């Protein structure tokens, strides 16, 4: 342990005591990485134990099991769960590995050396050494690069992953032809984030997802080798702060964007986040309602094309602002929704009402009626309707938990960016403890500023 | 004493025991505060735990009924008690405690002992500031929570048809009183609430800015990274650069405080002026002198069937609040609305 007057940090900022303590800081991270693996083991087995097969996966409050289901372990055609034992092996292999990570995290925090600079020169680092920092940055990009090739090997070779856009309904599909075209892969990145684009949250098939992870796997292996054999160039010396709290703040602003991206990823996308496992999206459940009452009222003898609404726009089918035949109602805002149950009914010129008066399939109205009663609105105590709804069901969508948790975590880590990037830029400048009171720089400025 | 040396009576033997520098100051005000404030808090914590509201309101409001912290309350009396003070020796209760609780008389127990508790607490901080020989600005600021309490809990129901339309003492019970004033009084539109928002939400700005401007213009008076250690309250110099603080905001916001005394009085002034103005608006709503309607936009929107503003949307939403809650919000009216006479949009 360590106290305040030997550091200048109180008990409430005492992890800042081990900034320049390389070995204690290593045990801080390995024990924390034990906790991420421990939670992923424990919350997996909690969700395996509380899995009920005669209920949907999204109804049971499961957020980790849809990730293993999206890889295609233990799922059948249409999102039916075959067996739960592949979800059990993923829970134990994290729960056992957490003890190994927990051991060396407790080891380097208590018994291992405080600074591993003089005894273990390969692992030792000073924060201002720009070669060693890029050296450690290069080691972990190769780990992230080889981790990104695990998803590609599992989709191309090791059984495949779940494709919700598969012909014949969604099941596990070996992705034999991943998209390696740079105009397609780097076309998502330069796409606008707004409606009809959705930056990278609209990636609509698994071939772009797996082919995009080929690109992110090679560039991180190549970019890792780039940073092992280079140092930052003099323009990068000129732009960055080279302290350990700066390197944290660089990571906090990068990861706070990623929390915002995965917030809008799980809310909007239904390819990497399949609706059989995560439930319908916000756009999916609202489009499912208009599709449900369109099939309800064709059977009750009504021309849903010629049916005029009370505003005069069209109760069931209206026209998109770019000219596509879409669903009417307040769900005109979600007209750029695409779904694997809905896209069989959709021709070039929007929806095809010839195809939609004669060829509504009975499985499509099964699935769209499921999505209407599992809309991602709920309550904080998991009630499950609009705020004007009685305590009947027990439901909040996983998409509603995944987006709300990761906007909040993405918001605070942007705040953590603003905290530490302000502090590390000021602590490197010398005035993070306060104004010097002898040369206050405002007193050497011209008044009437 | 008194620079003429009379002999001490029993008052002086009582004055120095009350004005004693013990752990908790009693004082002369504590003969009014500590019996009343303990029974407002004791009446609220008993009423939210055990006392029903099934007879005054037709709805359960205690932990023993099934309510939690958000929905339990000490609810107001029925509209049949008018403005009765509901003394337990009163003509309604007549000595029986278990019916005084059922008649909602424990509401007025909390409301009256809370009102004389606020007098006891405001006299407390005149009394301490005269012992400490300070200026009495802490009490003058507490006139504004007394301006809010008296105008809402006391003045407002006296102008209405009874103590029923008072706020009940709860969390969800305040929330309907809030939704009562939107639906019935259009109280967001009232310009005294608008000055009340700008005072309350502008004092929160001044609290956050003055806290952050001080904490980020501090002088480096210590060596370690804990800047809270580099302070002794018996120091004669300022702990933060006011000159740096002025030059910062004069270039960020264009206008900054240059006077430290005007700053802290402006932090005093904004929440007090905000609450005194909003207290005047609730005085106006006691008589139903609402700022409900802009008549020049009601004449136009009735003579032009396509003139829609966000104002006329708000008037339609208040019609929705009025007709859909008042079969259950006002059970004394005994109004039954058939479902076809309540207003209703399309398909909801």
């Amino acid at each position: 342990g360590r106290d305040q007057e030997t550091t200048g940090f109180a008990w409430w900022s005492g992890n800042a005591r081990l900034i320049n303590l390389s070995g204690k800081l290593l045990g801080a991270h390995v024990a924390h990485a034990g906790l991420i693996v421990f939670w992923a083991g424990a919350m997996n087995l909690f969700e395996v134990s509380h899995f009920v097969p005669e209920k949907p996966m999204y109804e049971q409050g499961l957020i980790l099991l849809p990730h293993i289901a999206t890889l295609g372990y233990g799922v059948g055609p249409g999102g039916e769960i075959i067996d739960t034992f592949p979800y059990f092996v993923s829970g134990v292999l994290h729960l056992i590995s957490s003890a190994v990570l927990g051991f060396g995290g407790v080891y380097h925090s208590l018994i291992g050396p405080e600074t591993l600079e003089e005894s273990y020169p390969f692992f030792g680092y000073v924060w201002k050494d720009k070669n060693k920092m890029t050296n450690i940055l290069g080691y972990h990009l190769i780990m992230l690069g080889l981790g990104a090739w695990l998803l590609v090997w599992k989709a191309m070779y090791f059984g495949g992953v779940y494709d919700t856009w598969a012909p014949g309904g969604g099941d596990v599909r070996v992705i034999t032809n991943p998209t390696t075209n740079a105009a397609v892969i780097f076309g998502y990145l330069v796409k606008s984030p707004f409606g009809g684009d959705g930056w990278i949250c609209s990636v609509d098939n698994m071939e772009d997802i797996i082919g995009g992870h080929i690109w992110i796997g090679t560039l991180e292996i190549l970019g890792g080798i780039w940073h092992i054999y280079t140092t930052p160039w003099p323009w990068a010396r000129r732009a960055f702060v080279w302290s350990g709290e700066a390197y944290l703040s660089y990571s906090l602003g990068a990861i706070g964007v990623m929390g915002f991206i995965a917030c809008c990823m799980s809310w909007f996308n239904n390819t990497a986040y399949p609706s059989e496992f995560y439930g319908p999206t916000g756009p999916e459940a609202s489009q499912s309602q208009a599709f449900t009452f369109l099939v309800r009222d064709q059977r009750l003898g009504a021309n849903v094309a010629s049916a005029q609404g009370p505003t005069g726009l069209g109760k069931y089918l209206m026209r998109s602002p770019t000219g596509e035949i879409i669903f009417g109602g307040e769900t005109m805002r979600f007209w750029d929704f695409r779904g694997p149950w809905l896209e069989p009914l959709r021709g070039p010129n929007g929806l095809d009402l010839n195809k939609l008066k004669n060829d509504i399939q009975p499985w499509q109205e099964r699935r769209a009626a499921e999505y209407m009663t599992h809309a991602p609105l709920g309550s904080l105590n998991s009630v499950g309707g609009v705020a004007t709804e009685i305590n009947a069901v027990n439901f909040v969508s996983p998409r509603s938990w995944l987006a709300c948790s990761h906007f909040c975590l993405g918001f605070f880590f942007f705040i953590g960016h603003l905290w530490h990037a302000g502090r590390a830029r000021a602590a490197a400048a010398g005035f993070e403890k306060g104004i010097d009171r002898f040369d206050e720089p405002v007193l050497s400025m011209r008044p009437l500023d | 004493i008194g620079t003429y040396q009379e002999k001490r009576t029993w008052f002086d033997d009582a004055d120095d025991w009350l004005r004693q520098d013990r752990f908790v100051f009693v004082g002369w005000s504590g003969l009014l505060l500590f019996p009343c404030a303990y029974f407002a808090l004791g009446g609220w914590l008993t009423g939210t735990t055990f006392v029903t509201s099934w007879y005054t309101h037709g709805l359960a409001t205690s932990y023993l009924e099934g309510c939690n912290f958000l929905t339990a309350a000490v609810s107001t009396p029925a509209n049949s008690m008018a403005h009765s003070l509901l003394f337990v020796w009163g003509p309604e209760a007549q000595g029986d405690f278990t019916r005084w609780c059922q008649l909602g008389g424990l509401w007025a127990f909390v409301a009256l002992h809370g009102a004389f508790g606020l007098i006891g607490f405001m006299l407390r901080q005149f009394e301490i500031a005269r012992s400490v020989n300070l200026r009495p600005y802490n009490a003058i600021a507490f006139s504004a929570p007394i301006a809010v309490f008296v105008s809402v809990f006391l003045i407002y129901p006296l102008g209405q048809s009874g103590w029923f339309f008072a706020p009940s003492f709860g969390v969800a019970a305040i929330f309907r009183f809030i939704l009562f004033f939107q639906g019935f009084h259009n109280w967001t539109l009232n310009p005294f609430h608008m000055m009340g928002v700008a005072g309350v939400l502008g004092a929160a700005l001044l609290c956050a800015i003055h806290g952050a401007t001080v904490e980020n213009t501090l002088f480096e008076d210590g060596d370690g990274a804990n800047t809270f250690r580099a302070f002794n309250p018996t120091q004669a110099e300022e702990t933060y650069s006011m000159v740096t603080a002025n030059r910062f905001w004069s270039q960020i916001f264009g206008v900054a405080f240059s006077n430290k005394r005007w700053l802290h009085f402006f932090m005093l002034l904004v929440p007090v002026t905000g609450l005194w103005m909003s207290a005047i608006g609730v005085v106006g709503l006691a008589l139903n002198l609402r700022a409900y309607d802009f008549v020049s936009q009601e004449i136009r929107a009735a003579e032009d069937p396509e003139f829609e503003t966000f104002y006329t949307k708000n008037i339609l939403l208040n019609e929705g609040i009025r007709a859909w809650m008042a079969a259950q919000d006002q059970p004394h009216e005994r109004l039954v609305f058939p479902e076809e006479v309540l207003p209703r949009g399309n398909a909801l």
Binding site: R2, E5, T6, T7, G8, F9, A16, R17, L18, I19, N20, L21, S243, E245, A427, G430, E432, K433, D436 | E220, D221, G222, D223, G224, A225, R229, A230, F231, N232, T234, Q235
Partner: peptide
């Protein structure tokens, strides 16, 4: 200067450099 735990060695004086005139912290 005693080189506190985030780098940034202290500019001479210790914690609360007015202890000589005021006596406490």
């Amino acid at each position: 200067a005693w080189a506190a735990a985030a780098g940034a060695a202290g500019a001479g004086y210790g914690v609360y450099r007015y202890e000589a005139a005021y006596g406490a912290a």
